[PDB]
Amino acid sequence: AKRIDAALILKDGRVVKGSNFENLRDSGDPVELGKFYSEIGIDELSFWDITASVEKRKTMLELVEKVAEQIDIPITVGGGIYDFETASELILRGADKVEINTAAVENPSLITQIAQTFGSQAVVVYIAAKRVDGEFMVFTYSGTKNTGILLRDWVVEVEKRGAGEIVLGSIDRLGTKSGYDTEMIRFVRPLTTLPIIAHRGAGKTEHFLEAFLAGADAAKADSVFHSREIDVRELKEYLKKHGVNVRL
């Protein structure tokens, strides 16, 4: 089935900018918010850490310990995971998947190291890409460094190295609400047999349909769900109505 994923951006243990769910005891608590999403029909969750402190490592491990106890859908953890030991720590603490991005681009061996022990199914590569002079290029350090590596080349290398899925984040859609970057999705689709997860640009229910027509296997969103602009259950009902194989 096509997957609907929610992502939660975290700093110092808190959901950055929080959420608009009034029913919740603490609307900026990542564990409670994650649990609520699992209950309404989210398929998988991403916890994306932007902490830099020096409590970052210990904070993420304590968060995944808690989440693993309370939430029973697949969990991905990401945000500055730079080496095998950090990834291993998180997986053994309860993360189903670890997401890497800057460290994977700089040291693609990391992909293979993790997959060698945990299987490719445990490895997510987030690829942040942008149009630069008519070429899709890969950006590292929170979308800030033009690595000079072509998206087309990196997608193939990521698969070769042993990643299990690719989150394709269009920097050209950061903060926008006009739709997923379906041109980018279509560009990548023929290049890899891996699951491709669309990220950035979702503003309304129909944008998810467009992403699936483009060949995405999953769609990730965050603020559009946290703001309550889109309701997860209404989204899945809509998608099912229009022939998309979602889990209901």
Alpha carbon of 44 to those of 21, 30, 47, 51, 81: distances in Å?
A: 19, 14, 10, 22, 19
Task: Name the residue ranges covered by the structural domains of the chain.
Answer: 1-248
Element containing residue 205 per DSSP (H, E): helix 205-213
Technique that determined the structure? X-ray
Handedness of CA 169, 170, 176, 181 (dihedral sign): negative
Cα 104 vs. chain centroid, distance in angstroms?
15
Task: Identify the residue whose tokens are 């965050």.
Answer: 222
**The domain defined by 1-248 carries CATH number 3.20.20.70:** yes
- For this entry, resolution in Å reads 1.8
Sequence-distant (≥ 6) Cβ neighbours of residue 159 within 8 angstroms: 192, 193, 194
Residue 5 near residue 46 (C-beta atoms within 8 A): yes
Cα 81 vs. chain centroid, distance in angstroms?
14
Tokens at 80, concatenated: 């500055």
Strand partners, 25: none
Longest dimension (CA), the chain: 48
**Burial zone of 134 (CB within 10 Å; 0-12 exposed, 13-18 middle, 19+ buried):** exposed
